Design a protein around this ligand. Structure first.
Ligand SMILES: OC[C@@H]1O[C@@](O)(CO)[C@H](O)[C@H]1O
Length: 300
């Protein structure tokens, strides 16, 4: 199967308004607007599917995947029967509340319609990431804190003062939050998240890792992180660089600079935008005066 072009673009922006969102995302997408917390890039999530342009014609990621699944996934086609990932730009400008994701096992046990969530984070600025308890805690003592008006639960977590392109891997059960933080978050194709509040507390108790987590357990390498199912890497481009898909679906995000893309056809990519590369493209070149492009890939 090789019906698809090398480079598939979103037809329209897929943005999410959030009270904690600032101005960064709208600005990436060429306009001025506060209160945008998220941009969903090539979402095949049923709550919020992206729409794409294939050779100039418009369709949903969901349609695209049901029709072109084997070609899109390539060597990952046997491993994944549903669309494997969700890619989001996140502008956590105001502090988010502490939350936690279930594993596949926990989500199934809780009877959720969605699966578990693992995620890899690529940070773009100097902000604060919070991940894992810095000491052992007791569920009961966390519940005492819920009684207070607005106990800062982030004070109980490892605090990371970031620099651009720091990475994190947030595993199921790990409590986390961000503040003044611009981030690319590649996760499972699931949005299950339980916040530290009365409404979600019964779910939190069932999935929360209450043990001390060491910093090395949540920190990735500079510009590079992976789970067992997917990964991301920052490619520094000065001039022309050849990029290999590995015969699996890739997504490219232009973090800095302007790129000319040359595969089966020629295209370009502006800072703030993403490109979907089907597995049927073995390799292609990207060209930039000096830029940084993020390659997101499936692991098989
Ligand atoms: O000061 C902001 C407050 O702190 C928190 O992060 C608590 O963990 C909440 O998001 C917000 O209510």
């Amino acid at each position: 199967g090789m019906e698809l072009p090398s480079f598939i673009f979103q037809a329209q922006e897929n943005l999410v308004e959030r009270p904690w969102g600032g101005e960064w995302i709208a600005l990436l997408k060429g306009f001025r607007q506060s209160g945008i917390g998220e941009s969903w890039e090539f979402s095949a999530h049923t709550s919020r599917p992206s729409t794409v342009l294939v050779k100039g014609q418009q369709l949903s990621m969901i349609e695209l995947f049901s029709k072109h699944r084997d070609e899109l996934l390539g060597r990952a086609a046997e491993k994944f029967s549903k669309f494997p990932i969700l890619v989001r730009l996140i502008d956590a400008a105001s502090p988010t509340q502490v939350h936690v994701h279930p594993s596949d096992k926990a989500a199934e046990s809780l009877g959720e319609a969605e699966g578990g969530v693992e995620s890899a984070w690529l940070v773009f600025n100097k902000g604060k990431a919070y991940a894992g308890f810095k000491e052992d805690v007791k569920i009961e003592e966390l519940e005492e804190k819920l009684k207070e008006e607005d106990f800062d639960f982030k004070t109980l977590l490892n605090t990371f003062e970031t620099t651009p392109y720091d990475t994190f891997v947030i595993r199921p059960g790990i409590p986390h939050a961000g503040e003044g933080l611009r981030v690319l978050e590649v996760s499972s194709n699931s949005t299950l998240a339980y916040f530290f509040n009365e409404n979600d507390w019964e779910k939190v108790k069932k999935v929360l890792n209450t043990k001390k987590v060491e910093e090395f357990e949540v920190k990735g390498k500079k510009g590079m992180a992976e789970t067992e199912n997917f990964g991301l890497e920052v490619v520094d481009v000065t001039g022309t660089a050849e990029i290999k898909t590995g015969g699996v679906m890739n997504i490219l995000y232009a973090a800095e600079g302007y790129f000319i893309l040359r595969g089966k056809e020629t295209a370009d990519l502006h800072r703030g935008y993403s490109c979907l590369v089907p597995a049927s493209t073995d390799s292609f070149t990207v060209e930039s005066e000096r830029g940084k492009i993020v390659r997101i890939y499936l692991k098989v």
